Amino acid sequence: LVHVASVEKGRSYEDFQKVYNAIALKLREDDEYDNYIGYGPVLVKLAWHISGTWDKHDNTGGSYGGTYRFKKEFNDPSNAGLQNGFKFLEPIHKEFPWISSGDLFSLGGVTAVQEMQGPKIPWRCGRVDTPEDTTPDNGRLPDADKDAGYVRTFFQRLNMNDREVVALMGAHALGKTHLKNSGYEGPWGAANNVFTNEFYLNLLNEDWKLEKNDANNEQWDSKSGYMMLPTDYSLIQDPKYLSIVKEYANDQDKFFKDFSKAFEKLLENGITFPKDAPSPFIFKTLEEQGL
């Protein structure tokens, strides 16, 4: 397929900045969600889940079509728990009806990261809603009970190399697993609504014990009360992965730079940007605007 980005007719930077600010102000206000974690982490997960269905082989899936809006994709067992991010964004969509779905979902992830003090992520508009029949079948998102080999193979379908895989996985500093959604339970660290290199530190520094949880799935548990999925843990089992983990644990700046690039790439996979398309936008945070 060819998916050409088409800017929402007659909208510019200032228009998008207003959507960003609406999301951001609502994040600030609805702070009680999930025991005061806030909706930040769920928005990031939502942006990854709608993008992660991409298949570099036939160009199907990815963020372009905003297909998560369709029941098939929406009810993906792998998407359990995301309906919360969905409901959070509805009201915003209602306020800015001209924005495409794909653009709203992706921008939500960007906003969340920047407002949680992460790096600035350049973002491009132009995703266009596609018909319910362009909706990818379930089973394109990754399992958590696998090893490094699985992770490498998987990510290859999205065109991500080792460095990009490790950078992206640092998003696991945010939020937590919920038994009911995924069959895993617990957070990855302590500051789960602030974007930092905490994930890599925990990984290297905690004394992890393999145990079975109440869903009868294995997870690595630390005495600090943190957890790691098998796939997270696999980052220290693979020699190639481990050296990048170390770098990130050592330099947050490097991590932020790599994450930013990787995240934008993920969000733009499968989209063709004409040469006349506006360059990527860099949105200001609420704090930068004095709001």
Ligand code: HEM
């Ligand atoms: C092997 C690849 C991955 C696997 C197996 C995986 C698996 C999971 C699972 C099982 C959960 C918990 C869901 C729940 O119970 O609510 C989760 C949460 C989360 N994932 Fe990942 N994930 C992967 C990659 C990523 C990537 C690439 C990102 C973003 C860059 C990401 C961002 C998040 C965030 C922010 C949360 C917390 C959500 C919340 O608190 O609701 N994950 N992931």
